[PDB]
Amino acid sequence: GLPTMNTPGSNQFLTSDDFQSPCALPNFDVTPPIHIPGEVKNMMELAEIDTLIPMNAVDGKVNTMEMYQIPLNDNLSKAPIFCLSLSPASDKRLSHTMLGEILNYYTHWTGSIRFTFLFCGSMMATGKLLLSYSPPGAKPPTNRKDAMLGTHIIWDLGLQSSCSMVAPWISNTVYRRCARDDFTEGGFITCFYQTRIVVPASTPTSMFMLGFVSACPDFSVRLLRDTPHISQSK
């Protein structure tokens, strides 16, 4: 017998343990693989797919189809159209998007995030919308004039029906937590009218847009964790 010594760690079961083991079924003949369309290699390939954001998660809209419809008026308003926290894992509306759902299985995340908006109103409706992102640690952009002081685009409504802004990876930390913490503050995403939407006679005065979220190519995650969005009786 070859002299050996068992070190701490012997006879233990770790759920992430990666070692060899005997085959339950020696010489089993495994069914040949076939090509199946749709092969997935990484979860990030799904993180990069645009997901419709349940923005209008307000009383009477939460858990109905209308939660995905962002209203727009033809009427004058100086108010924001919407306001959203950036953190994709923490925010109540974003945590249920594909990006959020994937990130809910991770402890930390990094990289820029793409926000794409689609206008679904009348073709004859015209106007301009201001979409912007302000990094965290300053008064929220509740006034349009402050909303401009950050990353922003102006969206010309027209045949090129969609546009996008990417929230750049601006962070003091390399990665941010997926936890609802104060240190890794998300930042602010808002949209204001650049100008009122104007429509021709006999056109609806209530327009809607659909906002989508997806990961950018620079995006990644650190560590896998259990998600808090599913449960089971004892």
Partner 1 sequence: GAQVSTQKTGAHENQNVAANGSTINYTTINYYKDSASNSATRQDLSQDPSKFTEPVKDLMLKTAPALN
Partner 2 sequence: SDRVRQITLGNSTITTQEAANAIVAYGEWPTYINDSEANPVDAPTEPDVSSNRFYTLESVSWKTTSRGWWWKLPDCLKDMGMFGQNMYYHYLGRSGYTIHVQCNASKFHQGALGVFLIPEFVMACNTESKTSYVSYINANPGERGGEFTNTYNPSNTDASEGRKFAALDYLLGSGVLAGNAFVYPHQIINLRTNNSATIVVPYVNSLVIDCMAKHNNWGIVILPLAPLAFASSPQVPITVTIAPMCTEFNGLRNITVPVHQ
Partner 3 sequence: VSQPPSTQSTEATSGVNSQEVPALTAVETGASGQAIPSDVVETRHVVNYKTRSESCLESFFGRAACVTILSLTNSSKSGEEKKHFNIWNITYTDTVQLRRKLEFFTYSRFDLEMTFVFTENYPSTASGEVRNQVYQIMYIPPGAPRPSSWDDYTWQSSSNPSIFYMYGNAPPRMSIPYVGIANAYSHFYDGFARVPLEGENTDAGDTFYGLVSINDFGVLAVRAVNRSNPHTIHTSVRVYMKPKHIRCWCPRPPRAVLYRGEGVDMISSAILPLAKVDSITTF
| By the rule CB under 8 A, 51 interacts with partner 2 | yes
β-strands 220-221, 151-156: how paired? unpaired
Q: Which does 4 bind (CB under 5 to 8 A by kind): partner 3, partner 2, its own copies, none?
A: its own copies
Q: Distance between CA atoms of 18 and 171, rounded to whole angstroms?
A: 35
| Distance, C-alpha 145 to centroid of its chain | 26
Q: Which is nearer to partner 1, 43 or 148 (CB)?
A: 43
| By the rule CB under 8 A, 179 interacts with partner 2 | no
Q: Which is nearer to partner 1, 14 or 201 (CB)?
A: 14
Which residue in 29, 39, 182, 226 binds its own copies (CB under 8 A)?
A: 29
Structure tokens at 225: 């964790």
| By the rule CB under 8 A, 38 interacts with partner 1 | yes
- # of chain residues touching partner 1 (CB under 8 A): 34
**DSSP summary character for residue 106:** B
Q: Distance between CA atoms of 62 and 58, rounded to whole angstroms?
A: 5
| By the rule CB under 8 A, 163 interacts with partner 2 | no
Nearest partner of 189 among 66, 81, 97, judged by Cα:
81
Which residue in 37, 41, 42, 228 binds partner 2 (CB under 8 A)?
A: 37
Stretch near its own copies under the rule CB under 8 A, chosen from 29-37, 66-74, 86-94, 179-187? 29-37
| By the rule CB under 8 A, 26 interacts with partner 1 | yes
**Cβ neighbours of residue 54 under 8 Å, at least 6 residues apart?**
62, 67, 68, 93, 96, 97
| By the rule CB under 8 A, 1 interacts with its own copies | yes
- The answer to whether residues 214 and 99 touch, using CB atoms and an 8 Å cutoff, is yes
- φ/ψ bin of 93: left (φ > 0), alpha (ψ from -120 to 50), beta (otherwise): alpha
Q: How far apart are the first and last CA of the chain?
A: 48
Enumerate binding residues for partner 1 (CB under 8 A). Answer: 1-3, 18-23, 25-30, 32-33, 38-42, 44-46, 48-50, 159-162, 214, 217
Task: Summarize as ranges the residues that interact with its own copies (CB under 8 A).
Answer: 1-14, 16-26, 28-29, 31-32, 174-175, 220, 222-224
